[PDB]
């Protein structure tokens, strides 16, 4: 179809606008166009054809036409990635490429690592890690050498990351002498620089794996750090930060070499150089020995306090990191911190201008929370009460975050009655006065209320006054915000035995349930869920049986969260209140969900399936199965599969004695899709019952008789999926004679191709290994184990690989090995005493 013509890139293709090298030459570029600019159904086919024939086409023309496409500026993230995927599949296919085209591809996909999104970063890493095995060590090393000498900061940054991905892919032991080359190179300055950064991204990508390799890198740090070049010296200091953080306290013995020059750099060069240096030493702090930690921390804290006034952003960010790490030191006392560090902290770094920039606000909050551990919690929050009542809304937000992360760890039990009062007062003030739309306030406020609960009652009343006050408001943002706060505060109210207050909450929310805005309505239903869950059903005001019939129309509201919380709450009434709602109304629920689960949400769809268990416990299981089986006939796969799930859960809660006979008839129905839904529903209903299927196994085997024998690879597939769960949970019951049958029908299917069929059949045979035991399952595998056919062999050695994985000692007695069978045999097997 060639959907969405690209005029410039197509006229860039030229080729056919309207001779085997001309035919492959043409069809190849035609396919490439199918991928880049084309129809989804078309490009999906051109992918399979391009990969199947990827070995046939010459990589010279493949990459010759393909690569320069990505050099244009008119590409889009969609299309560029559509070509990237072909790059990956072809490179991983051919597996061998000449060095010039290796260089071309590495240059083309090299910038991908720098893109802002980890989505592109990931595939940019994938092309390089797949190419590394293709080209090898020597090729890539010959590629990076002329590039590291480039004068372009951009490209140097690019192949820094690229070289790192190569080092991780082929190992950093093989690429390490190259790191020593660009590292220790006396020739070029940028070669030193990038040679140092490569160590950075190597440390980041390896993570903890950098330990065993940390010896060679610290050589480059110690020798190349001494360079007179300020940028070099800085980048080395950053490498110490990354390799220390990823290092974890082990590496101290190695870092002791570079430990010394950092301090003489600190006391002298100052400036941003001291920013990077204190970043490095700060990262060294956790790995320091307790005595050495004691000395060097006390040495650094003076420079920190002196540098509190730094107008620069970077230095403040570093200082916060150094305090963050030094907080864990046992040497510096919480008394020391409260007497000196903390008071000079809260006054300097909590100024309103601090709160303006988020990326700094992060480090501020996390640093403060790390301070809260050593500092007294009541002292920290004591200093944190004044920032709560400030009139700046983002500053109030940061003020909240600090309380959230702090109270989660420590809890508020340290606070006195008075400042505990001023705390909740401040939280209510900032909560009712909030201008900005953000989800944090109700979350963290709820965390505080979960932390302290019995103490809330005299505050618990006014808090709910504010709650209702916001529940009537003209802005849906504040509406759903306050509702989310409700659902969180519901469990706490139970601790004060306010239950009538929960009743009036249930009233007002139930009356506001008719709101037009879905985004708020969902949260309201969530608060309904918390209320009904917490409080006893009998004392619920509306009551429930009046609640649910108003819920039945809600299911058609579409959107998502409305059905999320709606299905959650309908399920809550399903398990909790079987009697209240009338069974015909429950049937209306069944029809509504049965129509509802076409939705694309796995949470809505899964929970929807789960509610049929409660509805099946309350109401007639056959009554549910009528609607379910009637819905199996629909062509839509989600309907078939998740109605099969419903049949499974109903068979779990009701028991298979009811559900299975009607299932078998629904299998007697001639329709394929129905039979598939039956077999899968049988799979799920078996995996949900561990000990039940043992008694039901024999009635299954005549059904699988026509299933496994059926011509359709689908029926054979899903039947094998039945044999998986059935065999796993029924293994060891003594039904092996039936399992022997079920297997005897499976063995002929081993040669069946396709990924789904082959993995379902493998898993089925592995389940049979547990129910039969290897010995017989072996006997088949043995009589087919080698064979001339080169195909039969490849097929059975898969089953024997999985068997060797699960069982080894189990197969030991069963090896058909005799002294005439093999030369050496084992002399000790024939010993008899």
């Amino acid at each position: 179809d060639l959907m969405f013509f690209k005029p410039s890139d197509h006229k860039y293709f030229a080729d056919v606008i309207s001779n085997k090298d001309e035919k492959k030459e043409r069809t190849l570029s035609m396919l490439l166009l199918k991928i880049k600019n084309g129809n989804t159904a078309s490009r999906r086919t051109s992918m399979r054809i391009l990969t199947d024939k990827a070995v046939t086409f010459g990589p010279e023309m493949i990459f010759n036409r393909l690569l320069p496409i990505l050099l244009d500026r008119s590409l889009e993230d969609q299309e560029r990635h559509l070509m990237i995927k072909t790059i990956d599949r072809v490179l991983y296919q051919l597996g061998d490429l000449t060095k010039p085209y290796v260089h071309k591809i590495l240059v083309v996909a090299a910038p991908l690592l720098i893109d802002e999104d980890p989505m592109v970063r990931s595939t940019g890493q994938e092309i390089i890690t797949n190419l590394s095995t293709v080209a090898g060590l020597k090729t890539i090393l010959t590629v990076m050498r002329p590039d590291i000498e480039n004068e372009d900061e951009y490209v140097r940054n690019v192949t820094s990351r690229a070289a790192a991905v190569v080092a991780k892919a082929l190992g950093v032991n093989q690429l390490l002498p190259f790191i020593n080359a660009a590292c220790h190179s006396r020739k070029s300055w940028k070669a030193r620089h990038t040679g140092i950064k490569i160590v950075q991204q190597i440390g980041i990508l390896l993570g903890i794996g950098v330990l065993n390799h940390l010896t060679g890198l610290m050589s480059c740090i110690k020798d190349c750090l001494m360079d007179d070049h300020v940028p070099v010296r800085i980048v080395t200091a950053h490498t110490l930060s990354t390799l220390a953080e990823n290092s974890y306290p082990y590496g101290i013995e190695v870092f002791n070499v570079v430990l010394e020059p950092l301090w003489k750099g600190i006391r002298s060069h100052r400036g941003k150089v001291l920013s990077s240096f204190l970043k490095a030493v700060g990262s060294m702090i956790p790995l320091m020995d307790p005595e050495y930690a004691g000395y060097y921390t006390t040495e650094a804290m003076r420079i920190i306090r002196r540098e509190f006034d730094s107008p620069d952003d970077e230095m403040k960010k570093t200082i916060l990191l150094v305090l963050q790490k030094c907080s864990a030191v046992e040497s510096i006392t919480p008394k020391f911190l409260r007497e000196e560090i903390a008071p000079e902290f809260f006054q300097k770094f909590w100024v309103r201008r601090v709160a303006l920039d988020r990326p700094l606000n992060k480090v501020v909050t996390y640093t403060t929370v790390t301070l809260a551990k050593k500092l007294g919690c009541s002292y920290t929050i004591d200093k944190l009460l004044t920032p709560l009542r400030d009139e700046a809304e983002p500053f109030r937000t940061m003020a909240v975050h600090a309380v959230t992360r702090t109270v989660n760890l420590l809890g508020t039990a340290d606070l006195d009655e008075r400042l505990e009062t001023r705390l909740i007062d401040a939280l209510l003030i900032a909560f009712q006065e909030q201008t900005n739309s953000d989800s944090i306030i109700f979350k963290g406020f709820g965390a505080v209320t979960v932390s302290l609960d019995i103490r809330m009652k005299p505050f618990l009343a006014p808090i709910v006054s504010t709650i209702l006050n916001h529940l009537k408001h003209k802005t849906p943002l504040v509406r759903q915000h306050a509702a989310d706060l409700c659902a969180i505060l519901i469990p706490v109210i139970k601790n004060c035995h306010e239950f009538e207050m929960l009743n009036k909450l249930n009233i007002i929310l139930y009356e506001s349930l008719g709101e037009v805005y879905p985004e708020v309505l969902g949260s309201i239903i969530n608060a309904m869920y918390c209320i009904t869950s917490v409080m006893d059903l009998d004392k619920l005001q509306p009551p429930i049986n009046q609640i649910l019939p108003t819920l039945t129309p809600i299911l058609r509201n579409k959107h998502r969260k409305v059905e999320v919380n709606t299905i959650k709450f309908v399920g809550l009434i399903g398990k909790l209140a079987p009697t209240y709602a009338p069974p015909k109304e429950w049937m209306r629920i069944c029809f509504e969900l049965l129509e509802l689960l076409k939705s694309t949400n796995k949470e809505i769809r899964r929970s929807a399936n789960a509610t049929f268990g409660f509805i099946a416990e309350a109401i007639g299981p056959h009554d549910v199965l009528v609607a379910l089986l009637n819905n199996l006939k629909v062509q839509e796969r989600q309907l078939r599969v998740c109605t099969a799930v419903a049949i499974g859960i109903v068979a779990k809660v009701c028991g298979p004695y009811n559900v299975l006979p009607v299932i078998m008839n629904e299998y007697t129905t001639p329709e394929t899709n129905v039979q598939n839904g039956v077999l899968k529903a049988m799979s799920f209903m078996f995996e949900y019952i561990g000990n039940m299927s043992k008694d039901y196994i024999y009635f299954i085997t005549p059904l699988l008789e026509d299933a496994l024998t059926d011509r359709d690879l689908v029926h054979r597939q899903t039947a094998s999926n039945v044999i998986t769960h059935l065999a796993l949970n029924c293994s060891g019951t003594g039904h092996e004679d039936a399992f022997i049958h079920l297997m005897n029908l499976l063995i002929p299917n081993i040669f069946e191709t396709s990924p789904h069929a082959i993995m379902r059949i493998l898993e089925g045979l592995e389940a049979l290994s547990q129910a039969l035991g290897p010995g017989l399952f072996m006997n088949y595998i043995w009589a087919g184990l080698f064979h001339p056919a080169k195909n039969v062999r490849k097929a059975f050695w898969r089953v024997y690989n999985n068997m060797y994985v699960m069982y080894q000692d189990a197969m030991v007695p069963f090896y058909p090995v005799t002294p005439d069978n093999n030369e050496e045999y084992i002399e000790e097997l024939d010993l008899v005493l």
Binding site: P670, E671, T672, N673, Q675, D706, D710, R711, D712, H715
Partner: protein, 196 residues
């Protein structure tokens, strides 16, 4: 596309079928018992029937029975001409004769570029088994066609009438077929097509 016909399942233990071949197995799919080919949709079934594969298997099954013992540019005004059927008789049986008349230089004055203009009307015997509506069938039609004018048909319930035996002395100018040369006349000067 099914034309409302009911194809019974293979296991229902055989109402006469149009083609007693395409069935539905224990599953919902459609199959050709001879060809042993599975077909997803009735359209695929029709592709199978119109395909040479199925036909070859039909000829093989018949051999088993014996063992066991220009189209594009076609002008079309779709104008119904005037036929004049009349019961004839000679010796020694009864035959039919049709007299079809054509335009009197009324509209054929705008088209004279020797484009099949020399081609006379053509007749063919068609089985009603295939129609645009496919409702009822079971009889033959003596269709008569000319480029501009619209086709014409005449129902022939009698299995055989006037089907002669070596009328002339075996002279071989097939024209279109034995039927046309054997028993048709085209008065092109007066534009009258006789058929008997």
């Amino acid at each position: 596309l099914s034309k409302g016909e009911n194809v019974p399942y293979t296991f229902q233990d055989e109402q006469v079928r149009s083609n007693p071949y395409i069935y539905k197995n224990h599953s919902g799919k459609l199959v050709c018992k001879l060809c042993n080919t599975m077909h997803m949709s009735w359209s695929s079934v029709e592709r199978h029937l119109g395909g040479k594969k199925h036909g070859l298997n039909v000829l093989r099954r018949g051999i088993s029975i014996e063992k066991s013992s220009x189209x594009x540019x076609x002008x079309x005004x779709x104008x119904x001409x005037x036929x004049x059927x009349x019961x004839x008789x000679x010796x020694g049986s009864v035959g039919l004769a049709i007299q079809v008349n054509y335009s009197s230089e009324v509209k054929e004055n705008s088209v004279d570029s020797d484009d099949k203009a020399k081609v006379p009307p053509l007749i063919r015997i068609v089985s009603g088994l295939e129609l645009s509506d496919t409702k009822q069938k079971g009889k033959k039609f003596l269709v008569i066609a000319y480029e501009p004018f619209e086709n014409i048909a005449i129902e022939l319930p009698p299995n055989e009438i006037l089907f002669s035996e070596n009328n002339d002395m075996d002279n071989n100018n097939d024209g279109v077929d034995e039927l046309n040369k054997k028993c048709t006349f085209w008065d092109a000067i007066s534009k009258l097509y006789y058929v008997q």
